[model samples]
Every structure is written in C-alpha cells, then in structure tokens.
Target chain A: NKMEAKIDELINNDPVWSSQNESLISKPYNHILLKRLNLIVQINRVMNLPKDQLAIVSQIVELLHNSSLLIDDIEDNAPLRRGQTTSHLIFGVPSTINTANYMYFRAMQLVSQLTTKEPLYHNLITIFNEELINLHRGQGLDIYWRDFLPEIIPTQEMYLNMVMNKTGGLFRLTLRLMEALSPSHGHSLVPFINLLGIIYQIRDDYLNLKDFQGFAEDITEGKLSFPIVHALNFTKTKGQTEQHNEILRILLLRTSDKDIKLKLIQILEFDTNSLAYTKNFINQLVNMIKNDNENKYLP
Target chain B: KMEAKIDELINNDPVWSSQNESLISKPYNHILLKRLNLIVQINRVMNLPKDQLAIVSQIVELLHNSSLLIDDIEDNAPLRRGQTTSHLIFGVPSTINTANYMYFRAMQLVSQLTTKEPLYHNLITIFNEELINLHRGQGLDIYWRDFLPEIIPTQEMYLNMVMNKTGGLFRLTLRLMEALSPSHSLVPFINLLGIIYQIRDDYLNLKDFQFAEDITEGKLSFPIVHALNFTKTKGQTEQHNEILRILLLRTSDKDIKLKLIQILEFDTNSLAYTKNFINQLVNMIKNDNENKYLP
Candidate 1:
C-alpha cells in the first residue's frame, strides 16, 4: 500500500487532477477495465517477481492503460465509456487531452523504479519506449482509416496488422518487461501474447456491433471494424456492388440513429454473413492458441 | 540539415503521410523555430559535442513545438505567432494525435544521446521528471483561469506554479546538456531563468501587447494575482469585484481590457510591482559574480 500510495500521489500531484478538476480526469480513468491491473498480476504470478517490483509494474501498466483510454475517447469522439460520460465531455477536450498526455511521461518515470542496474535499466527503457511507439502507430492508422473512410477500405490483413500494433502493443509491452525481468527469461510468451492480443481486439470490435449495451458505437463512429471490414471485402469479391456501396454509405453517415445503425448491423449479419465469419474467425484463433505446443508456458 | 531529418522521420513514417506531415508542421515552420533558440544558446555555453547537440536540438524542438500546438488548443487561441493554430487548421483530433506522436518521437531520440546505460537512464529520468512538473504547472494555470473567482491563487502560489511549469522545459534542456558535458551544475541558474521567463511573459501580456490576450483569457498571471490579492487584503472589495467581472467577460474588447489594465496600474500598482519583481529576479542572477552560472 505504501508504493501504491506513492503512485496515487504522483497522479494527484498534477494541479488539474489534484483539485475539483481531479473528478473530471478520474471519470475516464475509473471507467476502464482495471484489466491492466489484472494483466500485471498475471504477469507477476507467472514471473514471481518481488512484491515491490510487482507494485511498480502495476503502477506503470495502470497509467498507460488509463491515459491511453483518455486519448482514445477523444480520438473516437466517444460520448460514453463504461456507461459514464467521457473525460473530454466532463472537463472539456483541451485539459483532458493535456492531462492524458502528461500521464504518459509520468508512467515513463515509473520505469526507473523497476531496476537500478544500468544494463537492465537501458533494456527496460527500450522496451517501454518501443511499445509506446507501436501503440501510437497503430492508433494513428486506426484513426486515419476511420477519419477518411470510403477513401480506404482496409483488408482483413490490414486490420489485424493494425490490431497487432494497437492492442498487441500493451500486451507485448507487459510480457516483454516480465520476460526481461524474470530469471528464466521466457522467450515463448511473446507469440502467445500476440495471439491473445489479436483475439482480444477482434472480440472487442465484434462486441461493439453485436452488444446492445455498447450502443453500436463503432457504426456511429464509422469505424472499419473487423466484421465491417470483412463485410466490405466479402461483398466486393461477390461483386455485390450495390451492397458494398450501401454498406459504405451507411458507415459514412456517422449516425446516432438506432434504426440506421441497426440496418448497417443487419447487413453485416445477413448480406455478408460477417457476423458468423467473425465468430468462426475468433474461434479458430483461440483454437490455434489452445493447440499450440507453447500453450504450456502461457497456461 | 536538421529540417531534412525531421521531415524524413515524420513523413517517411508508415502511419503519417507526407501531406499530413505538412499540415502538422505548420506551427513549427521557419519563424517560430527561429524565435525559440534557447537550445542553441545553452549549447554554446555548455560547449556540447556537435553530434550530441544536433540530437538535443531535435528533442527540445519537438517538445516545444508540440506543447505550443496543445497550448493553443487549450487556451482556445485562434492565432499562434501570426498564423492559424494547428488545431484550427488540422482540426483538434488530428492535431492532438500529431503532437503526441512527436512527443514519443522525442523520447526515442534520448537513446541516441549516450551509449553508457547509466547516464542514458539519468537523462531519461530528467526528461520524465521535468515534463511531469510542466504539466502540473500548466494544469494549475489552466484551472485558475477556467475556474476563475472559484479559486484566486495567492502571489506565492502563482510564482510556485510558474517555477514548475516554465522551469520544467528550461531545466530539462540544461540538465540534459549539463549531464553530457563537463560543465558545472546549471540547475539553479536555469530555475531562475524559468521564473523570469514566465513572469516576464505574464507581465508583458498586460504591459507590452496592444490587445493583451491574457486579459481576455482571464489568466491568473503575476500582475493579476498580485492585484487580486492586494485588493482582498486592503479591504478594497469594489476594486476586487471589478477585476473579477472584467476577467469573467472573456472579451477581446480593447476598452474592457484597458479598464482591467488600468485597475492594476492605478489602484493596486500591481503592474509596477510585477516589473520590479522581474528586475529583482534578473538582478539576483546578474549580480551573482561568484557563481558564474551565466556568462
């Protein structure tokens, strides 16, 4: 709790976050999965690092995840996250954006606590920096395609590659840091984490369209989500030119209309059968992981 | 040569296109880049290695330009250095992402500073620490401005915030170069410089500029803070209320801005007080013959 207290102190020291402004910053932060913490705990359980070390690692992961989500909300123009108003909505985009970017460096500072040795410190910083760069690169491309839709309809391969950069980034970052720090120096965890990241992102994309609770935000945001990408490509190949154009037109509407969004979702369900394809695709990826010889290390 | 490298790094990246690079580079164009020569000045004093100096220059330029882009957006200022703000041109979302992208790109350059692992760690730690300080200071300034009349900071509080916000980038640049050189510590000198820079900026926004945008922004600047605190202590309730009123207007009206400036000049004598305070800081460093931190 002492180390955890320090992490809280570091976050709260920002004037924007320290006072009444703190509630605004905390809106988006508190809304996220606390999944980063779970991921860190899982890594610690696997590597069996010292209690102090795990605490610092958890702080770093939490900062990155929370901060990234804050920025992601703005990039997506997302109105609701975790059923609460997004931080940008509460505090205004300017302060929220600055605060989120500020936390990224704060997280970088925590990397120093993970090690004192020079070589290990260098390697750790490298891992930290590399993964962050990958995250932004993936995020940048995702934003680009969404912002300029119809101009570019990405293939499934392109979507997966973007996912590998975006979602795979944090997973690899967590695993790489654990592997580097562990005595056994497990190298096999990388591929397992990579596969896991892809599944996680695709599932997230699928659920955004399929889940009523999500409000089908991906369709409103005009995101070329996995199923949508699959649908676009499938219709194109079948030479269902009108269907492809219709799908493109609906996505380009950037609508909040429930009926219109539902229509687009139906097209994915019926015309392209993308909903079924995506389910099978996710299942196959998970099965590959289950059947892999490396499952022993991951499990 | 440095421009070519920056262009290549930004344009040739897989995620960013050359066209997008041109849009984002608007704020960092010729004039603004030339005006921010603090890095070059520090390098001259430190006598840093040429190769290392280039990397240092690039890192600070990236950070400085990126911060300005975000700062303009936060302040809602349509013009920056006589050109439209990046956010205004590229839209807020793209501008924010591009600025953030440059920040990470700057972090990547820290690795190229040294082959020695320990010093490299120290350099990054300095970069990380000062940036946190910068945000903390900036956050306070924004809060005080945005949440005006809700919390009017004391003169001491204002100075402390400036030390963190302004001192952050100054110290970050000097500390990194000092770490790489055989020079004596310049942290104290840089701290003093940051205070002067911020105070002068606050002072000039009222005293120097024709329109005085800070008045319109309702920023809790040095003079304004002094005037606010002065009135409250002296039981000048009417003067205090008037100052708050004009600030809350958030106006660009020259006459209204002048009325507020006149209050600081006549009632509280806060403008003169700020000018004297700035001189005192500069003189403190100037008269430091023994320390010789500055040339």
Candidate 2:
C-alpha cells in the first residue's frame, strides 16, 4: 500500500531483475522496498559496499524520485498521486517547489558521503550531475510539447526519443552510479537499462489509457503519450482532419470530466484504433528483447 | 547605460542560455559584475591564466542567473529587469526544472576548472558548501517571511541569515577563486561585503516607493526586523501591534508604505539605525578597518 514509482512491472518483466533479487524485487516500490532492493539490484553485482551506504544510494535516488514527482505534479497540474493528494495541492505551489528543489541539493549532499576516494568521488559527482541534466532535458521536451500543444504535436519517433532521455535518465543514472562503484566494472549495463526504460515507459503509457477506472490521466495532462502520438499521427497521415482536431481539442481542454476523458479513450479505441495499436506497439518492443518472455541479455 | 557584456555572454551560449530565448533574459545585476570583478581581483594576487579565470567567471554567472530564476518563482515575483519574469512567461513548472537543470550544468562546468583530482574536490566542496548554506539560509528566510508574526527574529538573527542567503554566491566566488589560486585569503572581506549588500537591499526597499515591493510581500527584512522588535522592547504597545498589522496587510499604497517608513524613520529610528549600520560596515573596509568584522 506504500507509494512510489512502481517497480512491480519491471520486476516481473525482466529476468535479470529476479535473478539477483529474491523477495526484494517482488516487493512494491517504496522506501523499504528500495532500501532492500539495493539501488536497482546492482548492489548484488558490485558487492563492494556496506548495507547502510547501500541504503544511502537508494535513498538518494528515491529522494530525487519523490522530489521530481512533487515538481512534476505541479507541472502537470495533477491533484492526485498514488490516489493521494499531491504536495502542491496541500502546501501550495511555492512551498512545494522550494521543498522539492531543496531536496535535490540534499540528495547531492549524499553523493559525497558515498565515497571518499577523490578520483572515484569526481566520477560519482559527474554521473549524478550528468543524469540530472539529462532528466531535465528530457522533461523539458515533454513539457514543451504539452504546454505548446498543437504548435508541435510530435511524431511517434519524437515521443520515444523524448522517453529515451526522460525515462532512460533515472534508470541510466542508477546503473551508471552502480557501474562506477562496481569492483568488477567489466560489463556495461547502460544499454540494457536504456532498452528496459523504453519498454517501461510505453507500457506505462498504454496502461494509463487501458486500465483506468476513469479516463486516463494522460488525457487530462494533455501529454503527448505514445498512443496519443500514434492517434494524432494516424489521423494526420490518413487525412482525417476532423478526428485529428478533435483529439487536439480534448487534450487542450486539460479536463477532468469523466465523460470527456471516456470520449477521448473511446475515440482511440474505435476510430483511430490507437488503443489496439499501442498494445501491439508495447508487445513489439517487449518481443524485441524477450525470448519467450525471457530477457535475452544481461550485463 | 548598462554594460552589455553579461548579456553578450548570455546570448553567446545556445545550449545553456538561449535555449529558452525570451525566458533566459535576467536583469543586469551588479552581483554579476562583482563576481566577475572578484575573478580579476584574485587574479592580481594569484596570477592564474586569464582564460582559466574566464571559465570561473562563467561558472559563477551561470549559478547567479539560474538562482534568480528560482528565487523569482519562490517569491512569486511578477517582474525582473523591468520585464516579466521567466516563470511567468515559461510557466512555473518549466522554469523550475529549467533553472534547476542549469544548476547541475554549472556544477558540470567545475570539471573544466582544473583536472587535478584533489583541487577539483576542493572546488566542488566549495561549490557544495555554499549551495547548502544558501538553501539553509533560504529555507529559513522563506519560512520566516511566509510565517510573518509567528516568529520575529532579532537583528543578529537576521544578519546571520543574510550571511548565508546573500553570502552564498559571494563566498562561492571567493572560495572557488581561492582554491584555484592555491588560497580563503580574503573570505572575511567578501563575507563583510555580503552583509552590507543585503542590508543595503533591505534599506533601499523602504527608501523609495519603486523599491518598496518587499513591503508588499511582507518580508521580514532587516529594518523591518529592527522596527518590529524596537517597538516591543521599548514597550510601545500601539506602535508594536500597528507595525505588524501594516506588514500583515501587505499594503501597496504609497501613503500606507510611507506611514510604515515613518515609524522606522521617526518613532523607532530603525531607518537611521540601518543607515548608520551600513555605513559602519562600509567604513570598516577603508584600510585599517578590515578587522572590524574579522577580528
């Protein structure tokens, strides 16, 4: 029942996720789950640090995760997160933003605590800085598309490229730090994790539309999610102007109306078939690296 | 006319500055000039390569501009440099992430200052310490300002807060330059400078209606701190309660603002107190007075 960015899907999906992780990966994503999870399970591979420092690394990642959520919820104007009220809704935007940003520095403070070796120290700091910058660049792309709306409705390719930066960022960050800290730094996990991140984002997007009781949060956010990108492009390429503008209008509404959200999803379900298209799209990505639902590669 | 060099350098970088275009512009601040000038001044002592100093100057410049973006958002300020703020144009969400993103980019620039591992460690420690100090100071400043009458700080408490929030950038400049110059030789001097800088800002807000926006925000600034407390300590109940009432009202009218100023200028002498206080601070640096704060 604890709240966090879900790890259950990735845990079940990736074979490598369970090989090193036993009970921990099966646990939901939360503070206790992450602490036991070993900073995305690379701790099992590196096998160099104490359990307490392991907790520090995961907490640092979690701190950024939650902090990013606080800011992102503000950005998206999301009132609820994990079915609870978002921070900005309660504390007001100014306090929430400052608190979130303040935690970013606090997390950076933990980076120095992870190591004392000056050389590895610089490398660790650089990795932290690198991924945060990447996350922001990716975030900026997502934000730009939504805020500017129809001024730039991205293609499917553009959406994945942005996902590659945004979602791949934190996954890459965890792996990169783990790699730097690894005693046996022979293999690179970055490419494997990057591929994993793309699948994770697409599935998250697909589920947002498919599994919601109400309309998907994505429509309310006006985000150009994977299916939305497909629907918009499908309408455009087929010269369906009315449908294209209709999708554009609902997205711009940034509405919470149950009927309005359902209408958009129904359009995707029937007219554009983007719902089925996105399901197939997720399966296609999942199949690319899976062997009978097994991960074909591991670092 | 304002010098155009900082603006020129700001425009010079497509990746860092111009990526946001209209949102990227900031008021031409003297802090930029002083941070740059600190580089030249320190170079006179340490004699580092000029181009190396160029990157250091650029590093502080980036941190400074990005900080303003965050501050404007936090304060919910409407304007900067006589133009609408970046957060207003770009939206709070974008500006928050964008400004924060630059903070990391500025940290990345530290790798360029020197390749020496130990020196770089010192460089980053300086960077980390000052930033933490800033937020530490900033967190308290915002808390006090937002909470207002609940917790009235003393003059001494206000000065300490200023040393961190206002001193964050000043010390960062001095510390980085010193670490590279193979040096904290002049930190007390810079530290003294930060105090005066903020106190003057607090002073000037009441000096004119144009700058009296701090009044509108009901900030717990220096002179306001003195006046509020002075009324209490002197046992002037009516004025004591009235000062808080006016500030709590967040009044914008010039007459209302002047009435509050009159309380500081005449009844409490808080305005004259801050003026003399700023003078005493500046005079300390005129040669033998260096030890005034340091000693």
Candidate 3:
C-alpha cells in the first residue's frame, strides 16, 4: 500500500500544511525522505488509527525527523543535505540554527495543544518528552564515555541501556502508539515488536563499524557503536599499553578525518574478538525472546 | 520620565525602602524578601486578585532571580541585583547548574498547579517556549556581533531584536493574568498596558543617556539604536563607515564613546524621534482598545 498517498491526503487537510509545501521539496533527499516518512504513516495505517490521534502522531514523527536532521548537520558540521546547503549553512548560522530551535518549540507547543483533547494525546506527549530528554542525556553520556578513560570498563548492560534509550525509545513509542490505536492485536505482540526494534538497532550498530561497500559511514560520525565500545573494553582488559589508549583518544577526536577513520575500521576488521562479542550479545537477546511462549511465533 | 517614576516608586515604597535600609544586615535575605514583597505590592497596585497576586508574584520573583543568574553567565558581569553575581560568587559551572535548578524549580512550581488550574500549565508552556525564543534571540545578537562586516543595524531591526530578547518576557508577564483568569474583562486592557510600558521603556532609554548622571554610571541606553541608524544612513562613505565601526566597538572608557555621543547629538534629534515614536505607539494601542476592540 502506498502509505505516502495517505500521508499526502492527511497533509492537504492539515491546517498548517499549506505553509510547509514549498519547504518540503527542498529538504534533504526529498524522495528518500518521503519514503522514510511513508514508513511512519504506513505504521499508522497498519494500526487503523483514529484520525485525531493520527494527526498529532504524524506531526510528532515529522518534527522528530526534522530535528534529527538539523542536529545531525550541526554535530557533523555538514554544510549540505539533499543537494542544497543545510539550514544553518544557508541562512547564516544564527537565523538558520535559531529557526530550527523555533521549529522545535513549535512542535513542542503542538504536543501541549494535544493535551486538551485525548488522554492518549497527553500520555504520548509525556512519553515522547521523556524519551527526548533521555536521548540527549544518552548523547552527553556517550560524549563523556568517548572522551574520558574510566578506570573500569563500562559493562555491556550499561552500553545496551544507553543505545536502547537513544534508538529503541522512539521505535518503542511508535509501536506503543500502534498498539493503542489498534486493539485487535494480542498483548503478546508488544515485546515482540520491541525486540524487533532492538534487533534492527543492533544490526545497524554492527554494520556501522564496518566499511560496508567501501563507505566508512559511522567512522566519520564518531558514533559510539557497540562494537567500538566492546573493542575498547577488550583492549583495556588485556592490559594493552598506554599507546593503545592514545590511539583510541585520537580516533575519538578526529573521527571525521579520513585517514584516522580508515585506520579505526582496519583495527576492527582485523580483530575477531570484536565480531564474536557482538554476535554473543545478539544471541543472548534472541535466546531470551525464543524462551518466551507468546513471542516465539510472531517473528 | 514614567520609567524613572516607576523605578522611584519601586525603590521608595516602604516595602522596598525598609529593605534597602537593612542592606548591610544579611543583604541576600533582604534583597530576596524585599523584591518578592515589592512584586506582590506591584500586583496589588495593578489590582490583581489577592490569590493571583501571590501566585504571580512568586513566579515573577523566581523568573527575575533566574534571569540575573543567567545574565551573569552570558555577560560575565561581576555584579547583579546589588550583589556579586551568582556565577562570580559560586563559579561559572556551579552558577550555570544553579540557574538550571531555578528553571526546573520554576517549572515544577507551575506544573504543580496543573491539578488545580491547567491554564497555569499552559502559561508555563508558553514561558518555556519564550525562554528558548529569548535564548535564540540572544544567540542571534551575539552571532551578529561576531560575523557582521559592519556593526551598523537599522533602528527597526535593533528594536525588533531587543524586543524579542528582553521585552518579550515583559509581554508574557502581562499576558499571564489573562490566561489565568479567562473571565477577566480587562484582558485586552492589560495587553495594551504591557505594550505601553515597553514603549515607555524604549523611549526613556533613548532619552536618559543624554544626562551625565546616567552616562557617568556606565548604563547603556536604547538611544544607541537610534544613533546607530542615524550613523548608518548618513555615514555612507567608507571613512565614515570605519568611524561608525569604531563607535560600535567603543568601550565606555574610550574617547570614541564621547565622540559617539556628540555625533548622535548632532544627528537629527534622536530624542524627538524616539519620544514621538513612543507616543504614537501608546496612542495607537489605546485607540485600538477603546474604539475597535471594546464593544
């Protein structure tokens, strides 16, 4: 089903839609962007949502994706998205960046406006705010983890908790909204959908560490993926020389530099232990789900 | 000016005056208590309801104190509200944390009222949005200073920027009562009052800098916007533009600051222009309220 068609129908009827039309075509990877956006609308359709509830949810997804793009551009200091320059890169940093902040506030106000309506609206807004707060906190934690060499290696549980908050929170909220909108699904499907989100995140994190098809993606982004975290801890456990510490620090600081990222990827590729560690983590998650009665049949 | 009168009233009201007399004896306690008391008194003077006066007075005081805390970080100034700035007294990071705490406390204070009055939460939601708006406006001003090739800004632009950065809060405060009490027939009146007060403030800032006492005290004024506009338009030559840049970059201590004063004075009477604009704005607001909006 062409979910994009439904989204466009909804968008045309939305009060604020007309103002955003000119801006959408210029947005980053507009076709792929709409495709990604269609996924959210598709999920809504799959849930057979009430129109009113779907309005705020669609708004939330759009705003969330826009903010993600804006912040990613800021952090990456990337000048362009799609073919045109990023908002900050084009409009002068102050106006461009501030506009993003303004748009973010507008999105928030829309959420607050939702509270006047349904109980679900209030619940969804509160949950989204909590998740966003945690997402930023996790980013800050990731920054500190990469910069500061703690005496004790961070446990896999801690790493998993951080990524789950950062990535899984949004996905989980999406599913939860779907469940709320659609009552036909049995209670068993909740954990199953959640696990699928976690698995998808885990796979993405794993692929991010590799030079998949010669694209050193996460290397330049300096993403604190599970593999890198595991590799760092593994080295520390082996009592590796201080030189290894220095190298890790260099990688964190200059992840955007091509040569540094290339070297970092090479180290990960050559290390079999890194591969085994991630596999073990995935296996544990699978085993936990497979043992559960209701969860076994869904996937 | 009306602003001086308001300040004098704020300063001399027994609630404020007695606290000033006790400044040496636990100054912080006096400042907090006196300001909070005066805020309540001001609400009473404005004829806000007894219950609302108390609630709003607390919010205002909290917001005012939080602003001083944040101002210290932004300006790196050593003094605030007649004492060492919080950041200077406690260290920048700690002061920042304290400021964040104040914001959290303010939100919690407002949020608690959601059970009794959900409109209070709506006001808070507005306040939070405005806080980010204020910060973005500040960031814009800072970035403008950093990157603009010329320091010159048009008077309208300068006013709009500062209004967003500073006066927006004042507008929010005035609008808060309307939200809290939807039945208040004077809601439109109060909105106009806020606009009038802000225009009066802008006008006085333009005029007060002319006086030596205000000048010697190192207080900057809104007339700078008027002067900047005048200079930008008249000083279109490269050399004159350079001079305008020098004026823009001048410290209070610089002789160029005095030269700026002279140039502004020589330019087409900024005092008259500012005063006329203020009168027009106030009258326009009053006329709109009286003739148009009023049934």
Candidate 4:
C-alpha cells in the first residue's frame, strides 16, 4: 500500500503531470579529401555513431591522407595541389619534407586521444601502422615500375595487385579504424572499398589520357596507367613490336611536347585500341558494384 | 649465333610463366607456413636459452612469412619458394588480409616470453621499433629505385638503406632474443649480415634465374649500384645512359636481359666486384668477425 501510494503520488505530482512517451532525439556532412571523410561517414550510418568522434577519425584520416599527398606532390614533381603551387616547390624540399614528415608524427599523437579503451587502443594503433606500411609498400613499387619501365613491362594482373596496395591503402586504413571502434564492426565494407579503390585509380588513369586533366600528363609522366599497361602487354601478345616500341619510346622521352603526348594517346586510341578497352572495363567493374546494391550505402 | 645459343640456353632452362599454373590458387597458409627454413639457422647466433627458443622460432616464423606475403605483393613478384605468388594466385585482397593479419597474431606470442610488466613492454617495443625501421628503410629503397638517375645512390648510401630494409627481420629476431637474455647486443653484427644477405640475394636473383628477373623490374641491385656509379665516372656517359635505358625497358627478352648482365660482366665488372665484396664480408665474419667486439 505504501509503495503504491509513493508511485501514484510521484507520477501524478511530477510537473502536475500525466504520462507521456519518451522523447527520442536522433538524426543527422568536400574536396578530394572529402572522399576519405565521406567513405567513413557513409559507413558510419550502419553504426550510427556520434558526429564528434567520427570527425576525430575523419581528422586523423585527412591528416595522414593530405600529408601523404604533400609528400607525393614532391615525389611527383607536382606543380600544384588543390590548384595552387606545391609545398616543395615553394618551401624547398628540406622544409617541405620535414613539414609533411612532421605532420605524420603529429597525426600519430592524435591517435592517442581517439579512444581510451586500452586493448581497443592497441589494435587501432596497429591498424594504423599496418595500412601505413602497406601504403609505402605500394608506393615503393609504384616508383620502382615508373623508373625501371619496360624492363618489367608489368601485366594487367600486376597493375591491379599494385593498386590494391598503393591506392587501396588509405581506403582500408579508414575502414579498419572505423570498424575497430564500431559495435557493428562486423558490417565490414572493406572488400567493397577495394573494388572502389581499384576503380578509382583506373578512372584516374583513363581520365588523364582522355585529357580531362593536365593534357594527357600521364604520357609525359611515363606512368604505368591502365591504358599504358594494357597496350604494352597486348602488343607483345599480338607480336606488334612497332606499337610496343612506339609507346615505350614516348614513355622514355618523358616529353612534355603536345604533339608527342597526342601521339601516345593516338597509339592508345588507334593502335592498341586501349581507350575503348579501358572505358568498357570501367563500366563493367562499376556496374558490378551498382548491382551489389551495397553501394547504395556509399554516399 | 650468340642469339641462337642464348635462345637454346633460355628454352632449355626449366620453364616458368604466370599462365602455366592452375587458376585455383593453392592454399597460401598451407604452402607458406612450412617454409620456415632460414630462421632456424640464424636462431643459434642470438643468445639461445634452449627452453624458450620455440616461442622465439614460432614468433619469427609467423612474422617472417607474413612479411613476405606483403613483400611479394609490393615487389610484384611472380613467385615465392617456386610457387605462383599468393597475390597472383588468389588475387591481392585475400592474400593481403591473410598476409597482414598474421603479423599481429605473431606479436601476440611475445608476452609468452616474459609477461613481467617492465620486460613485456620492452619486448613489444623491440618488435615495434624494428617494424617501423623496416618500413622506413623500405620507403627509401622504393624512393631511390623509382626515382633512379635522379637519386642514384652510391655504394655506401645503398649499404645504409639495406641496413634498414633487408636488415629488419634479422635485427628484430636478434633484438628480442638479446632483450630476454639479460644481454653484446650483436645488433651491428646482424646488420653486417643484413648487408651481406641482401647483396647476395640481389646478385643471386640474376645469377640463379639466369633469367635476371631483377633487371626486368629495373631494380637497383648491388651490382646495379656498382655498375650505375661505375659508368658515371666519365667516358661512359653512353654507358651510364644505356644502363638506365635498358633498365627502363622492363623487358623480359633473354637477349635484352643478357646484354645488361654482359655490361655488368664486360663494362663494369660489377658482377665479380659484388662477388668479391660479398666474400670479403663473409671472410670478415669467417676469419675475425665470427666472434668479436661489443665494447
């Protein structure tokens, strides 16, 4: 009787009040760097995590991601990033290298604040290291092939293998960290990202040659682009040494001459028929993703 | 004809190509786990406390193969231990996951050595330090290779790079062993071995394959370092340029590969120079270096 009296009086007296349903509050994000952030945020909806922490994770990713780019800009002899002068060209390699390299150190410190669970903390740090290792592994091979060139004449199979390491490094790192901190961690979208990461580079390779950016710069860059790798292997298989030699010649010339660059593009277009092959390959890979319906999760 | 003899020589050598193998990859773990050959030999050099050496061997073996799994993928290698590489056989994704996972799994064994709080941290630190050193070294090695001609490393510079990259596993192994032994941190000794091992591996890749796979990859091997710098001392501006030109070709043609090797043989004598240098390193260890100095 006392207990019943207490309960009745508390609810009745509360705000002079009557019963009501609980108020449940819920719900609810640019640039190429935004892609990494978007990748994490989209995957987060499955976990529906807090905005503040994901921003922290997003911050860590952007720091490492941009720093790599800053270093790579120097590595690539890049004239610009985000449409301005590169850090190295203006600041000097010593200062720029130190700065980007210093940025990597600072990002490592930020990983400390990301979470407090000691065991979870260890896995997250290692997750960071492994992917970071992978990036270099991929990056090194990338530099190797470019410098060494036709000496290796890597196949289609080889290029993708490198892509998984070089390009896919950050994608996997972002997901692994997000998943490590997630309760819904089992909802892994890693393999899916690998597909996207692979396609991402293929698009880059395709577009540069298509002259969408920088006027067929990859030809001058002597890059082992998708169009280039395919043409090299195909010419050999078909015994068209002239086509093979022509492509190799331009690559070694490392020429910025528009006519020469255009000539290589023509070789891909007409001689090797690589441009059409590349576009078809792209659509097929993409359609496969779209069919998965899981891409709907990606923003 | 030099070409005819070369063709016969190549064709007669045991055949290998990417497509001749099965499409279905053999189980990678099954193949890789059993390839624990070298670590067992090197384990005795570090302070061996017999009883706990299994944990030592066990840790090294797991991490070692795990390292190769990532390496073969990075190096774009077609084979490892004479099997189609895991990345090639099953594709890069599964191979990467399966490859990268075991590294942490191997580190999990470190506590089994000594979980005494202070020592435990030290052991993990030893492992972590070497892991970072390994990558940093690898990072530069890659940088120099890709940025070749731009940053052609001298022999001394190349030594330091190997001192970090190829040297990591042996260094990591010896480090963990000595830290436990209540340590002559023979770290420099292992590093010397590191240079020797890598230089030899670089040379033998050409020598054994007779295929000269390294040339096709345009790798800046030990002899390559010697040959590249060898040509740079003047009249051979053409020699220097031709060395880099063939390197850029990425060619698998036996004749093309042979021309580069012959240049090493005839022009630079880098092949003999490297062989003699490796013997000197071996003799350094064999005669006076086998047991000496930590003061």
Q: Rate the local accuracy (lDDT) of all candidates.
A: 0.77, 0.73, 0.50, 0.66
Candidate 3 wrongly placed segments (more than 4 Å): A1-39, A51-55, A76-86, A112-121, A147-153, A173-184, A188-204, A212-223, A255-257, A279-293, A296-299, B1-110, B116-163, B171-224, B232-240, B243-295
Q: What is the lDDT of residue B99 in candidate 3?
A: 41
Error of 3 at A277 (Å): 3.0
Q: Which order, best to worst by DockQ?
A: 1, 2, 3, 4
Query: What are the DockQ scores of the candidates, in order?
Result: 0.27, 0.19, 0.06, 0.01
Docking class of 1: acceptable
Q: What CAPRI grade goes to candidate 3?
A: incorrect
* lDDT of each residue in B1-295, candidate 3, tens digit only: 5223222321221111243223211212323543455444435435666666566666666666665565545444555545666545444433433343344345445544345344555666666666654554444444444344434455444544554556445545655644554343333433344434654664564355542222332222345556555655776455345434653462445465455555556654666766766566555545555454232
Alpha-carbon shift of residue B35 in model 2 (angstroms)? 3.5
Query: What does candidate 3's lDDT look like per residue over A75-122, in tens digits?
Result: 445555655566556443334333444454556566664445455554
Error of 3 at A59 (Å): 2.4
Every candidate's chain B TM-score: 0.88, 0.85, 0.66, 0.83
Off by over 4 Å in 2: A1-39, A42-50, A213-215, A292-296, B1-34, B182-184, B251-255, B287-295
Each candidate's interface RMSD (Å, one decimal) is 8.8, 15.7, 17.5, 22.7
On a 0 to 1 TM-score scale, where does candidate 3 land against the true structure?
Answer: 0.62
Local error of candidate 1 at B126, Å?
1.2
Q: Model 4: share of native contacts present?
A: 0.00
